[PDB]
Coordinates of C-alpha atoms and ligand atoms in Angstrom, one line a residue:
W1 CA 36.7 -220.5 -111.8
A2 CA 37.0 -224.0 -113.6
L3 CA 35.8 -226.0 -116.7
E4 CA 33.1 -227.6 -114.6
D5 CA 31.6 -224.3 -114.0
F6 CA 30.5 -223.8 -117.6
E7 CA 28.5 -225.6 -120.1
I8 CA 30.2 -225.8 -123.5
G9 CA 28.9 -225.3 -126.8
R10 CA 29.8 -225.6 -130.1
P11 CA 33.1 -224.4 -131.4
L12 CA 33.4 -220.8 -133.1
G13 CA 36.6 -221.4 -134.9
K14 CA 40.4 -221.0 -135.1
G15 CA 42.9 -223.8 -134.7
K16 CA 46.7 -223.3 -134.0
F17 CA 47.1 -222.1 -130.5
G18 CA 43.5 -222.5 -129.4
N19 CA 39.9 -223.0 -130.3
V20 CA 37.2 -220.8 -128.9
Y21 CA 33.8 -222.1 -127.7
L22 CA 30.5 -220.8 -127.0
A23 CA 30.1 -221.1 -123.3
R24 CA 27.4 -220.7 -120.5
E25 CA 28.1 -219.9 -117.0
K26 CA 26.2 -222.8 -115.1
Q27 CA 24.7 -220.2 -112.4
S28 CA 23.6 -217.5 -114.5
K29 CA 23.0 -219.0 -117.6
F30 CA 24.9 -216.0 -119.5
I31 CA 26.5 -216.5 -122.8
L32 CA 30.3 -215.9 -123.2
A33 CA 33.2 -217.1 -125.1
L34 CA 35.8 -219.6 -123.8
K35 CA 39.3 -220.2 -125.3
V36 CA 41.4 -222.9 -124.9
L37 CA 44.9 -222.8 -125.2
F38 CA 47.5 -226.1 -124.8
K39 CA 50.3 -225.2 -122.4
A40 CA 53.0 -227.8 -124.3
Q41 CA 51.7 -225.7 -127.9
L42 CA 52.6 -222.5 -126.1
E43 CA 55.9 -223.6 -124.8
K44 CA 57.3 -224.7 -128.3
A45 CA 56.0 -221.2 -129.7
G46 CA 57.7 -219.6 -126.9
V47 CA 54.7 -217.2 -126.4
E48 CA 53.8 -218.1 -122.8
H49 CA 54.8 -214.4 -121.8
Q50 CA 52.8 -213.0 -124.4
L51 CA 49.7 -214.6 -123.1
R52 CA 50.7 -213.1 -119.8
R53 CA 51.2 -209.8 -121.4
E54 CA 47.3 -210.2 -122.7
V55 CA 46.2 -210.8 -119.2
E56 CA 47.9 -207.7 -117.7
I57 CA 46.5 -205.8 -120.7
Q58 CA 43.2 -206.9 -119.8
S59 CA 43.0 -205.7 -116.5
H60 CA 43.8 -202.1 -117.5
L61 CA 42.4 -202.0 -120.8
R62 CA 38.8 -201.3 -121.3
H63 CA 37.3 -200.0 -124.6
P64 CA 33.9 -200.7 -126.3
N65 CA 35.6 -201.9 -129.5
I66 CA 37.9 -204.2 -127.7
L67 CA 36.8 -207.9 -126.3
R68 CA 36.7 -207.9 -122.5
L69 CA 38.8 -210.5 -121.1
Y70 CA 36.7 -211.3 -117.7
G71 CA 39.0 -213.9 -116.3
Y72 CA 41.2 -217.0 -116.7
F73 CA 42.1 -220.5 -115.2
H74 CA 44.1 -223.6 -116.1
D75 CA 43.9 -227.1 -115.6
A76 CA 47.1 -229.7 -115.8
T77 CA 47.2 -229.3 -119.8
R78 CA 45.5 -226.4 -120.8
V79 CA 45.0 -222.6 -120.0
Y80 CA 41.1 -221.3 -120.2
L81 CA 40.4 -217.6 -121.1
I82 CA 36.9 -216.3 -120.5
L83 CA 36.0 -213.6 -123.1
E84 CA 33.4 -211.6 -124.2
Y85 CA 31.1 -212.9 -126.7
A86 CA 30.6 -211.1 -129.9
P87 CA 27.2 -212.6 -131.0
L88 CA 27.4 -211.6 -135.0
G89 CA 30.8 -213.1 -135.5
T90 CA 33.9 -212.3 -137.3
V91 CA 34.4 -209.4 -140.1
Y92 CA 36.1 -212.0 -142.1
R93 CA 32.7 -213.7 -142.4
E94 CA 30.8 -211.0 -143.1
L95 CA 33.0 -210.0 -146.0
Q96 CA 32.6 -213.5 -147.9
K97 CA 28.8 -212.8 -147.2
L98 CA 28.4 -209.2 -148.6
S99 CA 31.7 -209.6 -151.1
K100 CA 32.4 -206.0 -150.3
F101 CA 31.2 -203.6 -148.0
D102 CA 30.0 -200.1 -149.2
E103 CA 31.6 -196.7 -148.1
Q104 CA 29.5 -195.7 -145.2
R105 CA 29.9 -199.4 -143.4
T106 CA 33.8 -199.2 -144.2
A107 CA 34.2 -195.6 -142.7
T108 CA 32.1 -196.6 -139.4
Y109 CA 34.5 -199.7 -139.0
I110 CA 37.6 -197.8 -139.7
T111 CA 36.7 -194.7 -137.1
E112 CA 35.6 -197.5 -134.5
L113 CA 39.1 -199.1 -135.3
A114 CA 41.0 -195.4 -135.2
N115 CA 39.2 -194.7 -131.7
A116 CA 40.3 -198.3 -130.5
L117 CA 43.7 -197.9 -132.0
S118 CA 44.0 -194.5 -130.6
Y119 CA 43.1 -195.6 -127.0
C120 CA 45.4 -198.6 -127.4
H121 CA 48.5 -196.5 -128.3
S122 CA 48.1 -193.7 -125.8
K123 CA 48.6 -196.2 -122.9
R124 CA 51.7 -197.7 -124.7
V125 CA 49.9 -200.7 -126.4
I126 CA 50.7 -201.5 -130.2
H127 CA 48.5 -204.3 -131.7
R128 CA 50.4 -206.5 -134.2
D129 CA 48.0 -207.9 -136.6
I130 CA 44.9 -206.3 -137.1
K131 CA 43.1 -208.3 -139.8
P132 CA 39.5 -209.5 -140.8
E133 CA 40.2 -213.1 -138.8
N134 CA 40.8 -211.0 -135.5
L135 CA 38.2 -208.5 -136.0
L136 CA 34.7 -209.5 -134.2
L137 CA 31.0 -207.9 -134.1
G138 CA 28.8 -206.9 -131.4
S139 CA 25.1 -207.2 -131.0
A140 CA 24.7 -203.6 -132.4
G141 CA 27.1 -204.6 -135.5
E142 CA 30.1 -202.7 -133.9
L143 CA 33.5 -203.6 -134.4
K144 CA 35.3 -205.5 -131.5
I145 CA 39.2 -206.3 -131.5
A146 CA 40.1 -209.7 -130.1
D147 CA 43.7 -210.5 -129.0
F148 CA 46.9 -208.6 -129.4
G149 CA 49.9 -210.9 -129.4
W150 CA 50.3 -214.1 -129.7
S151 CA 50.1 -212.8 -133.1
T152 CA 50.2 -214.9 -144.3
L153 CA 52.0 -211.7 -145.1
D154 CA 49.0 -209.7 -146.5
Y155 CA 48.7 -207.2 -143.6
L156 CA 52.4 -207.0 -142.5
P157 CA 53.9 -203.5 -143.3
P158 CA 57.4 -203.0 -145.3
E159 CA 59.2 -202.6 -141.8
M160 CA 58.2 -206.1 -140.8
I161 CA 58.8 -208.1 -143.7
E162 CA 62.1 -206.4 -144.4
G163 CA 63.3 -206.8 -140.9
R164 CA 63.6 -203.4 -140.2
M165 CA 62.8 -201.3 -136.7
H166 CA 58.9 -200.9 -136.4
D167 CA 56.5 -198.5 -134.4
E168 CA 52.6 -197.7 -133.8
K169 CA 52.9 -197.0 -137.3
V170 CA 52.5 -200.7 -138.4
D171 CA 48.7 -200.3 -137.0
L172 CA 48.4 -197.6 -139.4
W173 CA 49.3 -199.6 -142.3
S174 CA 47.3 -202.5 -141.4
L175 CA 44.2 -199.7 -141.1
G176 CA 44.9 -199.0 -144.9
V177 CA 45.1 -202.7 -146.0
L178 CA 41.9 -203.1 -144.0
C179 CA 40.3 -200.2 -145.5
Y180 CA 40.9 -201.4 -149.1
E181 CA 39.8 -205.0 -148.6
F182 CA 36.8 -203.9 -147.0
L183 CA 35.7 -201.4 -150.0
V184 CA 37.2 -203.6 -153.0
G185 CA 36.5 -207.2 -151.3
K186 CA 40.1 -208.3 -151.6
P187 CA 43.6 -207.1 -150.2
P188 CA 45.8 -204.6 -152.1
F189 CA 48.8 -207.0 -152.2
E190 CA 47.3 -210.1 -153.2
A191 CA 49.6 -212.6 -155.5
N192 CA 49.8 -216.1 -156.1
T193 CA 53.1 -216.7 -154.1
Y194 CA 54.9 -215.5 -151.1
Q195 CA 57.8 -214.0 -153.6
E196 CA 55.2 -211.9 -155.5
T197 CA 53.5 -210.7 -152.1
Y198 CA 56.5 -210.0 -150.5
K199 CA 57.8 -207.8 -153.6
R200 CA 54.5 -206.3 -153.9
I201 CA 54.2 -205.0 -150.2
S202 CA 58.0 -204.2 -150.1
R203 CA 57.6 -201.8 -153.0
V204 CA 53.7 -200.9 -152.4
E205 CA 52.7 -202.1 -155.8
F206 CA 48.9 -202.0 -155.8
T207 CA 46.3 -200.3 -158.0
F208 CA 42.2 -199.5 -157.5
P209 CA 39.1 -200.3 -159.2
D210 CA 37.6 -197.5 -161.2
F211 CA 34.5 -197.4 -158.3
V212 CA 36.6 -196.6 -155.2
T213 CA 35.9 -193.0 -154.9
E214 CA 38.8 -190.1 -154.6
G215 CA 38.3 -189.5 -150.9
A216 CA 39.1 -193.2 -150.2
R217 CA 41.7 -193.5 -152.3
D218 CA 43.5 -190.5 -150.6
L219 CA 42.9 -192.0 -147.1
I220 CA 44.3 -195.4 -148.2
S221 CA 47.1 -194.0 -150.0
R222 CA 48.2 -192.1 -147.1
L223 CA 48.2 -195.2 -144.7
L224 CA 50.2 -197.2 -147.2
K225 CA 53.2 -195.0 -147.5
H226 CA 56.3 -196.8 -147.3
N227 CA 58.0 -194.7 -145.2
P228 CA 56.2 -195.0 -141.8
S229 CA 56.7 -191.4 -140.6
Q230 CA 55.0 -190.4 -143.8
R231 CA 51.7 -192.1 -142.8
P232 CA 49.1 -190.1 -140.9
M233 CA 48.4 -190.0 -137.0
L234 CA 45.0 -191.6 -136.0
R235 CA 44.0 -188.0 -135.2
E236 CA 44.1 -187.2 -138.8
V237 CA 42.4 -190.5 -139.9
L238 CA 39.5 -189.6 -137.6
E239 CA 39.5 -185.7 -139.1
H240 CA 39.8 -187.0 -142.8
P241 CA 37.1 -185.6 -144.9
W242 CA 36.4 -189.1 -146.4
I243 CA 35.7 -190.2 -142.9
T244 CA 33.7 -187.0 -141.8
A245 CA 31.8 -187.3 -145.2
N246 CA 30.3 -190.8 -144.4
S247 CA 29.3 -189.9 -140.7
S248 CA 26.0 -188.2 -139.2
Ligands
45B301 C1 25.3 -214.3 -140.3 C2 25.4 -215.3 -139.2 O1 24.4 -216.2 -138.9 N1 26.5 -215.5 -138.4 C3 27.5 -214.5 -138.7 C4 28.9 -215.5 -139.2 N2 28.9 -216.3 -138.3 C5 30.1 -216.3 -137.6 O2 31.3 -215.6 -138.1 C6 30.7 -217.5 -136.6 C7 31.0 -216.7 -135.1 C8 30.1 -216.3 -134.4 C9 30.6 -215.7 -133.1 C10 31.9 -215.5 -132.8 N3 31.9 -214.6 -131.6 C11 33.3 -214.5 -130.9 N4 33.3 -214.6 -129.6 C12 34.8 -214.4 -128.6 C13 35.3 -214.6 -129.5 F1 36.8 -214.6 -128.7 C14 35.7 -215.1 -130.7 N5 37.0 -215.2 -131.1 C15 37.3 -215.5 -132.2 C16 36.5 -216.7 -133.0 C17 36.9 -217.5 -134.3 C18 37.8 -217.0 -135.0 C19 38.2 -217.6 -136.3 O3 37.4 -218.4 -136.6 N6 38.9 -216.6 -137.2 C20 39.4 -217.1 -138.4 C21 40.7 -217.7 -138.2 C22 41.1 -218.3 -139.6 C23 40.4 -218.1 -140.6 C24 39.1 -217.7 -140.7 C25 38.9 -217.0 -139.5 CL1 37.2 -216.2 -139.4 C26 38.7 -215.8 -134.5 C27 38.2 -215.2 -133.3 N7 34.7 -214.9 -131.4 C28 32.8 -216.0 -133.5 C29 32.6 -216.4 -135.1 C30 27.9 -217.6 -138.0 C31 26.8 -216.8 -137.4

């Protein structure tokens, strides 16, 4: 494949490593997404092997709630990734529109995530940074995870900011933060400065608005335990009463 094989549309967003553009395959007129990463920019970060980790990951890993990488190619100065196109966009933007999701919507998202993350883990794959700007939406409103790593302190667990050994439990922490932000509208450790957020995350200082229900409080509080070992398994998250309360 090559750049001349596609019609490029408007950009969809991002900026640091690569922008991601609307694309159309010239032959089929089928819609898909196209990421442009810069080779030199990748070499300075030293993440070139992490880009290869993705290409190797994507040849094995398939899940309805994870974006398919269809293929890849490269010219003299760029690396192009032929991605699946999530036509409803990023969860980040939905959260700005709706300000906050309701329980039934949050519970569905978290289940889709727990199923996704459960699959990833069982094949020795830890996602690093699940956050709203890395979560996309399918045509049926379903959660789709972009990226993995190549991988703001807001979603990082205490082990990572405090420089400790880390596990797949980092993803369980993120899920907790992601659940809180969904329900209340803002992340639980939000502060004015790096120093506060660090302190707050380190010490797990967060509180709940009165409206958050007992069940959601419980699930989130389990996920945001400082001790990673004390956090639940994805099995237990899927079998939590609040999750299985908010499901058909
Ligand atoms: C309601 C409505 O009319 N909408 C929904 C809101 N909306 C959008 O979200 C724009 C939008 C539309 C479609 C996509 N689809 C998609 N396809 C494949 C991809 F690989 C992909 N990857 C991206 C694309 C963009 C971003 C991104 O901008 N993230 C981000 C980074 C920093 C700050 C904020 C954000 Cl959202 C992250 C991942 N995006 C991504 C964005 C415009 C259209």
